Nucleic acid binder design. Structure first.
Ligand SMILES: [Zn+2]
Lengths: 325, 82, 216, 122, 218
RNA sequence: GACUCUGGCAUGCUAUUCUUAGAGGGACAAGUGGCGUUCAG
């Protein structure tokens, strides 16, 4: 029963179900959220720190490079996986486990990758979010050793091996379906959903592909046979000359190019929270905007803002009197 | 630059661009004089001789010095056919 | 390569190009780069003709070898992808490396601590490193660049068509440039493989430091 | 009398900050290693730097050993800078290749490649 | 005492570069005035075209400064033009002299009729443009002199042009635009291509590539 | 004069142990003993 950072981040009160509670020091020291760090100073101390000897770390590394998840995991993820492997070897027999995992089989459908299936609130034709379902809607819910991991890539390699995994729920998980990003230039898959440039060839070419992993150790990938996905419509357009200085914003062609620092002021990037106990004392219902700073005059916007504007193809017609920032 | 006596009355002769045959001026600081090493045809090592190409600043501004140098290299047998 | 059989691109070079991903261009395309290309596949990725890549790489190697003092060649990267490779390239040949931020006025402002006067410029990206290219246009500097499909050929004299976005491709192209310069110079035999492996030129990416030092 | 200049001091400071390992007790070995490490054009200030690094290493050796211990990341940054694996990452057994890339290789006379695997777009 | 910084300055300080025209041959930027003071030296004469005061607007108030237009010229050869604004009139004058030495350009001299003796006039009619000011220089027969307004007369006499016809257009009342336009035309004398310069150019070695073994030593 | 250049000795390279004139060496407080804030001297 090893605990990842996702157990403490999601406030898993699961010290009672397990007895071999083992954690690394780097999984507990890298957490920056104040609430769970306060929780760790209050929680009963039955966990104990344990460091793995590196032969298990070596072996976890060579099949991490074979399962296709080595760029997806981090080093502390490798440490946690080696920790649960070495305890499964120490307490349980090792011969239960198969190495050199199986081949993935391909089964594609006509569904778009952006179809909103497996979202709790959405319902096609009943699917209701009720007060009795809030604690249960986490993910697809399904003896002595276990894991408390929410990251998918560790689960993918772990069920490729064959260790039983559990979550902050009680009963163990047999099936794990999720999404990965696949490059259609170099065919390298990433489990990091946040990134937009692939690690191998560096192009902005990752596309969503769904994956399902069984407890037996079978990975299978659903592609989309939809021509809308692989359509080169708004991909070629004239780019301006590269410009430098303190105010230039380049069209973001690579993952590691140096942008000038253009940050919003702290008054600009405060959103009002309405459930604060001292909110009603305020003179206004909303946070006052920023109209006086230099970042307001330079029309600096948040990174998450204006996403659908970027998704329109540049070789199209905007409205006559507008300018796209 | 040459009178009736035959004396060459001129301060200097400016070089011309290899791509557009324009005179490279005295204050044309975007002009390029590139030396390209030519190699022995058996061992493929630097022989010691070289081909010299001059490209004026206007062609280099136009973005066309690349194709200019490439076609001059095909002309001089440095870059092979296709 | 003047149709020389010794200078032709071999099988293992093609294998390294395909493994790194050098043939994969961008989805955008500048019209001056349309000479160096094979076709656009249906996904939108432009495919770079590797024979033209080899020819322009050999032309750039010929340009570099033709300079008597190897320190007069300046080799510049700003983004992390090329950084280590540039340093390794210097250790291969003796060129002057500028890795990190390029201070503006390095070639024009004669009253400066970092002022220098190169004879050749070899650069990683014309988009990221636009400032040394403009600066080179001020000071009569010829320029060699590693160009992608979406790269401006403004003030570029020899453009090498390659994938300059991925780390392995950038490192591989720098490694083969150093290899061909040292082979034309005569310090390495062409018949034997180089003992310097291209993994030395790659971006090293500190979480890969921790992942590799853990498994060591 | 005689006094040391600032340029020799700062160059010697950079030299001791970088390559403390190579320096030794004899003077002329310090002179030759300082000659082959960095670019110094003139002989006289090079000899001045050699004398000054000899003086400061005699001063550091007398100092209790702990300055030397904290010089540990320099070599790791160096060994990391020059790390290579045992097997090349570009030497892959099977590499996936587009059909159009396969046509390009066929037209460019590399049709007899064996490590290639053509994956059709699904 | 001159301690050069550029490679060109170090070569000029030594006996490697014999004439200034070599620097003109390879279109190299001249960044040190001591190169010009080394090659031309005592032959250079300088005429202050204009001293005029301005009141620069600062937050402490309007402070008086002086702007100097200075043309410098090697007769029978070279001219430069310089503009400098400074606190003191002497500082502005010497800054304009330095800036005009940095901008020394050579001028082409030709013949009007038959080619007997030294060249005296421009080879063809050339045009320089600066801020709506157009200055046109036309070849003139020997002995006519410079038929122009006083400011391009000063620059053309300093160029070694013995005789020339001139035609100006635009707001000639602004002196800087007028001087810059006539400077532009007398630079376009070597920017122009004639059937004299039709032979293929043999490329020599640049000073940086010829004296590299001397330049590695310093 | 804590500025710049620089000499003594070369049986060394260059057309060369006796005359030459270019380059390369060689000297840097380098070493030792005392006085010294144990560091500047
Ligand atoms: Zn990719």
């Amino acid at each position: 029963v090893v605990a990842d950072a996702g157990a403490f981040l999601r406030h898993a009160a699961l010290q009672d179900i397990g007895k071999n509670i083992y954690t690394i020091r780097e999984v507990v020291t890298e957490i920056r959220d104040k609430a769970t760090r306060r929780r760790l100073a209050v929680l009963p101390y039955e966990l104990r720190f344990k460091e793995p000897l590196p032969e298990y770390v070596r072996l976890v590394t060579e099949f991490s490079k074979k399962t296709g998840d080595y760029p997806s995991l981090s080093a502390t993820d490798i440490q946690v996986l080696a920790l649960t492997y070495q305890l499964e070897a120490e307490f349980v027999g090792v011969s239960h486990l198969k190495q050199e995992p199986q081949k993935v089989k391909v089964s594609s459908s006509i569904q778009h990758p952006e179809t909103p299936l497996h979202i709790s609130g959405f319902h096609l034709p009943g699917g209701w979010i009720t007060p009795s379902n809030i604690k249960q809607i986490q993910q697809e819910l399904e003896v002595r050793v276990g894991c408390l991991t929410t990251d998918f890539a560790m689960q993918n390699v772990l069920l490729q091996m064959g260790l039983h995994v559990l979550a902050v729920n009680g009963m163990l998980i047999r099936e794990a379906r999720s999404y990965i990003l696949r490059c259609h230039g170099c065919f390298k898959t990433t489990s990091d959903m946040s990134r937009v440039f692939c690690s191998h060839c560096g192009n902005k070419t990752l596309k969503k592909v769904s994956v399902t992993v069984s407890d037996d150790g079978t990975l299978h990938m659903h592609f989309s046979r939809n021509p809308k996905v692989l359509n080169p419509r708004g991909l070629r357009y004239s780019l301006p000359t590269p410009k430098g200085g303190k105010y230039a914003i380049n069209p973001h062609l690579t993952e590691d190019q140096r942008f000038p620092q253009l940050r919003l002021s702290q008054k600009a990037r405060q959103k009002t929270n309405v459930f604060a106990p001292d909110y009603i004392a305020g003179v206004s219902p909303f946070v006052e905007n920023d109209i006086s700073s230099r970042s307001a005059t330079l029309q600096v916007r948040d990174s998450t803002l204006g996403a659908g504007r970027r998704r329109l193809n540049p070789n199209a017609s905007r409205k006559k009197f507008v300018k796209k920032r | 630059m040459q009178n009736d006596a035959g004396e060459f009355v001129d301060l200097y002769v400016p070089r011309k661009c290899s791509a557009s045959n324009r005179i490279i001026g005295a204050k044309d600081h975007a002009s390029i004089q590139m030396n390209v090493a030519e190699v022995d045809k058996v061992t493929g090592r630097f022989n010691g001789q070289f081909k010299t190409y001059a490209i004026c600043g206007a062609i280099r501004r136009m973005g066309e010095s690349d194709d200019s140098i490439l076609r001059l290299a095909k002309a001089d047998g440095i870059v092979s056919k296709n | 390569s003047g149709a020389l059989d010794v200078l032709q691109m071999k099988e293992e070079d093609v294998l390294k190009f395909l493994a790194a991903g050098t043939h994969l261009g961008g989805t955008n395309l500048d019209f001056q780069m349309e000479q160096y290309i094979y076709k656009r596949k249906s996904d939108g990725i432009y495919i770079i003709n590797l024979k033209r890549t080899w020819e322009k790489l050999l032309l750039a190697a010929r340009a570099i070898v033709a300079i008597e003092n190897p320190a007069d060649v300046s080799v510049i990267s700003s983004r992390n992808t090329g950084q280590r490779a540039v340093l390794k390239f210097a250790a291969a040949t003796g060129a002057t490396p500028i890795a990190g931020r390029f201070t503006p006025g390095t070639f024009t402002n004669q009253i400066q601590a970092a002022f220098r006067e190169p004879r050749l410029l070899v650069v990683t990206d014309p988009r990221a490193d636009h400032q040394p290219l403009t600066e080179a246009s001020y000071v009569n500097l010829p320029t060699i660049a590693l160009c992608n499909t979406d790269s401006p050929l403004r003030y570029v004299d020899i453009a090498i068509p390659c994938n300059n976005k991925g780390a392995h491709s950038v490192g591989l192209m720098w490694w083969m440039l150093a290899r061909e310069v040292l082979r034309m110079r005569g310090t390495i035999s062409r018949e034997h493989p180089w003992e310097v492996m291209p993994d030395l030129y790659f971006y090293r990416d500190p979480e890969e430091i921790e992942k590799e030092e853990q498994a060591a | 009398g005689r006094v040391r200049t600032k340029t020799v001091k700062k160059a010697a400071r950079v030299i001791i900050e970088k390559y403390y390992t190579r320096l030794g007790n004899d003077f002329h070995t310090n002179k030759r290693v300082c000659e082959e490490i960095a670019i110094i054009p003139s002989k006289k200030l090079r000899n001045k730097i050699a004398g000054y690094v000899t003086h400061l290493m005699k001063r550091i050796q007398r100092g209790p050993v702990r300055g030397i211990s904290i010089k540990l990341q320099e070599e790791e940054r160096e060994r990391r800078d020059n790390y290579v694996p045992e097997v090349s990452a570009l030497d892959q057994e099977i590499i996936e290749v587009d059909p159009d890339t396969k046509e390009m290789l066929k037209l460019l006379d590399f049709g007899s490649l064996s490590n290639l695997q053509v994956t059709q777009p699904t | 005492e001159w301690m050069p910084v550029t490679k060109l300055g170090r070569l000029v300080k030594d006996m490697k570069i014999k004439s200034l025209e070599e620097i003109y041959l390879f279109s190299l930027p001249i960044k040190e005035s001591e190169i010009i003071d080394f090659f031309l030296g005592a032959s250079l004469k300088d005429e202050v075209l204009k001293i005029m005061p301005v009141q620069k607007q600062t937050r402490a108030g309007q402070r008086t400064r002086f702007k100097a237009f200075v043309a410098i010229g090697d007769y029978n050869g070279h001219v430069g033009l310089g503009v400098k604004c400074s606190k003191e009139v002497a500082t502005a004058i010497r800054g304009a002299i330095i800036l005009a030495k940095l901008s020394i350009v050579p001028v082409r001299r030709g013949y009007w009729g038959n080619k007997i003796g030294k060249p005296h006039t421009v080879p063809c009619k050339v045009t320089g443009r600066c801020g709506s000011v157009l200055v046109r220089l036309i070849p003139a027969p020997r002995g006519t002199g410079i038929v122009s307004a006083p400011v391009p007369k000063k620059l053309l006499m300093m160029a070694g042009i013995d005789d020339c016809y001139t035609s100006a257009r635009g707001c000639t009342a602004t002196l800087g635009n007028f001087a810059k336009a006539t400077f532009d035309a007398i630079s376009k004398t070597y920017s122009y291509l004639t059937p004299d310069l039709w032979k293929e150019t043999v490329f020599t070695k640049s000073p940086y590539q010829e004296f590299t073994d001397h330049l590695v030593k310093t």
